[PDB]
């Protein structure tokens, strides 16, 4: 008994600046691909989607635009908000979405604070792995080795603070479990005292978990190398969840005059990143997205990043939940019901299975990259962690 | 020549009287100012419509401003007063700036509201911000030739008053090159007084602290047992607003520890705001006290800095609105109005009030110390006048 056609209004809040992996032009092709995929069926026939793409400016702008649109539309609110991804941009929008009972899905907002959804962040469903998920994986990695202490070394912008929130994910989990952590932060955009960093590391712990730009990490590793810290006395880890495809070929390589030392230095470094699966569907998905972005004037990874994949799946998940709430006799305006429907379930995303936990946070799967052959400087994945299963396993 | 002005005011403060700046305590102050105003710098007939909304010292302040503006029946208020709470105020200030609406508060004392080049361009602070207290501490340190300090405060991760308070000191000191050791704890959790005192014992001789007065009495008691009172250490606590806490005999509780506390406090100095009075202030206080008691509540004797500042907030707004209307602009030119509230001195109900070139009220402070240990008598020992930037001990 097909319901009446629906007119779903979605507001996309991401950066216009293509410097970000989750900029509007980079993500739009994926959202459109998923909408294309949904209309031919779970929604009432004749249903249409109106999508507004708005610049979040990775900041206060996201909130301003949300508010301005509602006011201009005389109180009318979007039916679905996608993004922001930036932590400080997302928190105010999440607060309002919860207050207005609107569903908000994001492949970002990875910070630990969004974990508490009793009130403030009710209504936020995270479609990509939050930092605490990477933290749980690090705990398992530590339990695997029987390690119980670590030095956390990260760059803190005091602005977007991506690496600060990343390591907060580790700190939170480790503190819960009782592992000891030494904390050392610095601002990598300022003049660096590479020797003070390395000296603090040698005075604190032997297992070091770091997060900073690929070049800052390289600088730190080259300096640790001259202090004789790269031959086995320390176990370094760096976190590169969103762009770690340089490995296999050599994340140390820079066609630089420090290339050989870097390759040696990196024999003691392991890199944590997202375990990314593939299907022929995902492969096609990437090609189309890549083409669209390319004739748009942008370069792009060969396999669309997690933010892009995440947002594609965010639409499938919204439609999935909306379809169920509709069939149950509720409306698209019952945001809380839509949000609860997106939680605690497994569905088929563009790259495979996707499971959202009972707190509305996607389970993450992670891989560990290590140098498997020091002569060549070959880096491969030595082990994975499957979040839902909660098990870490070294690869055969 | 000019028609009656109808100014819509949105006041965002806590309904909960647990706060010294709750709606009940501050409303009387705004009303008093309103009368004084409506009877004249503004075209006669001019009337203010004031909406008092619960800020809940949190997210609700944002939700109320937006629900009022983005409603189908909505419109932008002409003036926003409050929030006071730092996390409640940040979002409102950003919006006020985006919507070109003037925002005045006796709160938003944190250092971050200092940078007004962009997001906080439409906020003028009528009460002394924490950095102003930090400037006073810098002058006090220079006076003694002190160059290092231990900052020890409670950080509850919620309203974080003491964290923001010592941040004012930290900012000024780092800028100036003085070294500070940092030690935070959550007083809302079981205290590890032994660790606190041992950490102090090992860091610096001058200790600047901020925590509830009972948290401070405890620290001081353990320090007393460790022989740290009586000379070896100079302790300071910050009690800028609550008169029950900076009043003479801050060590007394009618406790079984009252004697030890009096002796311990001989080494403690308290920083608070240097307040002034004049005939009118008394009337204002009497009148304010009247409404508040009629509203079923125990008063705090004379009114705190928030009540005073919000009364002066109205007056400063009017002065700015005048000189702006003159220049031919409207109440809707928030940016223009705010610029007029900056870099000027006017008469508040307690005495002269000066707002600096960045839209922040200049602050005067006093240091209270025990001048008679047998008696446990505490008196003002020195003052700091923010605008002149001079610290001076009293005769």
């Amino acid at each position: 008994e097909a319901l009446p056609p629906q007119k779903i209004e979605v507001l996309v809040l991401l950066p216009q600046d293509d410097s970000y992996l989750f900029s509007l032009t980079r993500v739009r092709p994926a959202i459109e691909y998923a909408l294309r995929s949904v209309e031919g069926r779970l929604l009432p026939p004749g249903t249409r989607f109106q999508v507004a793409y708005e610049d979040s400016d990775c900041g206060n702008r996201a909130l301003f635009s949300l508010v301005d649109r509602v006011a201009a539309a005389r109180g009318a609110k979007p039916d679905l908000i996608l993004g922001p991804v930036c932590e400080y941009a997302a928190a105010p929008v999440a607060r309002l979405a919860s207050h207005w009972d609107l569903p908000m899905l994001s492949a970002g907002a990875l910070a630990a604070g969004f974990q508490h959804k009793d009130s403030e962040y009710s209504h936020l469903t995270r479609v990509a792995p939050a930092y605490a998920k990477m933290g749980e994986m690090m705990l398992a990695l530590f339990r695997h080795h029987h390690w119980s202490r670590a030095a956390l070394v990260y760059s803190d912008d005091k602005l977007e603070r991506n690496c600060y929130f990343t390591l907060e994910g580790v700190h939170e989990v480790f503190q819960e479990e009782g592992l000891h952590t030494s904390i050392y932060s610095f601002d990598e955009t300022k003049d660096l005292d590479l020797e003070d960093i390395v000296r603090n590391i040698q005075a604190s712990e032997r297992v070091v978990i770091m997060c900073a730009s690929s070049d800052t990490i390289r600088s730190i590793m080259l300096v640790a190398h001259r202090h004789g810290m790269t031959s086995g006395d320390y176990a370094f880890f760096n976190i590169e969840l969103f762009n770690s495809s340089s490995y296999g070929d050599g994340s140390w390589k820079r066609g630089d005059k420090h290339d050989f030392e870097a390759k040696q230095a990196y024999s003691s470094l392991q890199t944590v990143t997202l375990l990314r699966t593939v299907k022929p569907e995902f492969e096609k998905f990437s090609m189309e997205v890549k083409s669209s972005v390319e004739k748009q004037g942008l370069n792009m990874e060969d396999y669309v990043n997690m933010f892009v994949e995440g947002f594609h799946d965010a639409i499938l998940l919204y439609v999935l939940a909306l379809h169920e709430v509709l069939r149950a006799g509720y409306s698209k305006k019952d945001g809380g019901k839509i949000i609860q429907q997106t939680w605690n379930r497994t569905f088929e995303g563009i790259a495979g299975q996707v499971s959202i936990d009972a707190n509305g946070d996607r389970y993450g799967d992670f891989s560990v990259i290590a140098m498997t052959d020091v002569e060549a400087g070959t880096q491969e994945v030595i082990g994975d962690y499957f979040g839902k299963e909660g098990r870490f396993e070294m690869r055969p | 020549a000019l028609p009656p002005q109808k100014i819509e005011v949105l006041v965002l403060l806590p309904q909960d009287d647990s706060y010294l700046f709750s709606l009940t305590r501050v409303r009387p102050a705004i009303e008093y100012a309103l009368r004084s105003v409506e009877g004249r710098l503004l075209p006669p007939g001019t009337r203010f419509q004031v909406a008092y909304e619960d800020s809940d010292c949190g997210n609700r302040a944002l939700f109320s401003l937006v629900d009022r503006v983005a409603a189908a029946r909505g419109a932008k208020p002409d003036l926003i007063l409050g929030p006071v709470c730092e996390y409640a105020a940040a979002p409102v200030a950003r919006l006020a700036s985006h919507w070109d609406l003037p925002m005045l508060s006796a709160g938003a004392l944190a250092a971050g509201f200092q940078h007004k080049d962009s997001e906080y361009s439409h906020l003028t602070r009528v009460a002394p911000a924490y950095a102003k207290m930090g400037e006073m501490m810098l002058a006090l340190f220079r006076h003694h030739h002190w160059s290092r300090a231990a900052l020890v405060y409670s950080d509850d991760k919620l309203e974080r008053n003491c964290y923001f308070t010592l941040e004012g000191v930290h900012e000024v000191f780092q800028e100036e090159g003085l070294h500070t050791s940092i030690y935070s704890f959550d007083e809302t959790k079981d205290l590890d007084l032994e660790d606190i005192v041992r950490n102090i014992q090992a860091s610096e001789r001058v200790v600047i602290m901020c925590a509830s007065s009972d948290t401070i009495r405890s620290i001081m008691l353990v320090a007393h047992r460790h022989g740290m009172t009586s000379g070896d250490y100079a302790f300071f606590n910050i009690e800028l607003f609550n008169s029950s806490s900076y009043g003479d005999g801050s060590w007394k509780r009618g406790d079984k520890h009252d004697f030890e506390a009096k002796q311990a406090y001989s080494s403690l100095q308290t920083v608070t705001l240097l307040r002034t009075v004049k005939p009118e202030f008394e009337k204002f206080s009497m009148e304010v006290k009247s409404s508040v008691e009629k509203q079923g509540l125990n008063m705090e004797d004379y009114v705190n800095m928030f009540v005073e500042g919000f009364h002066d907030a109205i007056l400063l707004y009017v002065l700015a609105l005048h000189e702006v209307l003159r220049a031919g602009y409207s109440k809707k030119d928030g940016g223009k109005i705010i610029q007029q509230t900056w870099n000027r001195t006017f008469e508040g109900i307690a005495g002269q009030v000066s707002i600096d070139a960045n839209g922040d009220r200049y602050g005067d402070f006093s240091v209270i110390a025990m001048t008679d240990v047998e008696a446990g008598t505490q008196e003002v020992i020195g003052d700091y006048f923010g605008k002149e930037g001079r610290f001076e001990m009293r005769p």
């Binding site: 400080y88 630990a112 604070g113 508490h116 956390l152 952590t181 | 971050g112 930290h170």
Partner: peptide, 18 residues
């Protein structure tokens, strides 16, 4: 440690020093 499983409110401001 600039951390401590707290400060959920990390939003709407930044100031300096943790």
């Amino acid at each position: 440690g600039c951390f401590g499983l707290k400060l959920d409110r990390i939003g709407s401001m930044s100031g300096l020093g943790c």
